[PDB]
Design a protein around this ligand. Sequence first.
Ligand code: HEM
Ligand SMILES: [Cl-]
Length: 179
Amino acid sequence: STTIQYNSNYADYSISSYLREWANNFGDIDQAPAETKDRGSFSGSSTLFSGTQYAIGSSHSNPEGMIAEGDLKYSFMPQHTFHGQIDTLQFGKDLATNAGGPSAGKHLEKIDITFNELDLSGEFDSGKSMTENHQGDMHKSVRGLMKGNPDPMLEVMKAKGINVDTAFKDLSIASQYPD
Ligand code: HEM
Ligand SMILES: [Cl-]
C-alpha cells in the first residue's frame, strides 16, 4: 500500500494544499528563463535519460525540489515521455548534489513529504502518438508538476484511493517523521 511520511510542520496541510503551495513556488518550467532552467537529473545508470533516481529543482530560483526513485526512463526526442515505475516520490526544498557529484544522485536538505510504494507507472510505445503516450499516469503527473500544475498528480492519487484533502495528521496512511 502507498504510505506517507511528513515533516511535523505540515501536520495541518493536506496533500492538495501542500502540492498547491509547492507547485506555485516551483513555477512552470516552460515559463522560466533558459538561464535558470533545471530539466532534472537522472542518476543510477550512469546515463543521461534513464536511471533509478530523477531529481529536479525549481527553475525560478526558488528552493523547491522533487525527487523520484524507481525504474525511470525518458524517451527525449521526439515524444519526450517519462515512463517506467516510480516507487518513491519526495518533496521538499534545498536540492543538493551528493559528494560524488550528479552521477551519484541528489538529496533534499529539507524533506517535507515522502510517498512510499507509490506504484506510479506508465508505458511508452514509439508506435503511438505523443498524445497517447502522454496519457500515462507517470508522465502526465510528473510533467504537470514540472509545469507548476499539481492537478494531474492529484487526480492520479484520488484514483488510487487516497484522500488528497485530509490533513496529514488525520490521514490513516501517514506518519510524522520523528521530532
Ligand atoms: C535530464 C532530463 C531532461 C532533459 C535533459 C530534457 C531536455 C529537454 C530538451 C532539451 C527539450 C527541448 C526539445 C527540443 O528542442 O526539441 C525537452 C523537451 C521536453 N521535455 Fe524534456 N528533458 C528532460 C526531462 C523531462 C521529463 C522527466 C519530462 C516529463 C516529465 C519531460 C518532458 C518534456 C516535454 C513534454 C518536452 C517538449 C515540450 C512540450 O511539448 O511540452 N522532460 N526536454
Ligand atoms: Cl523539460
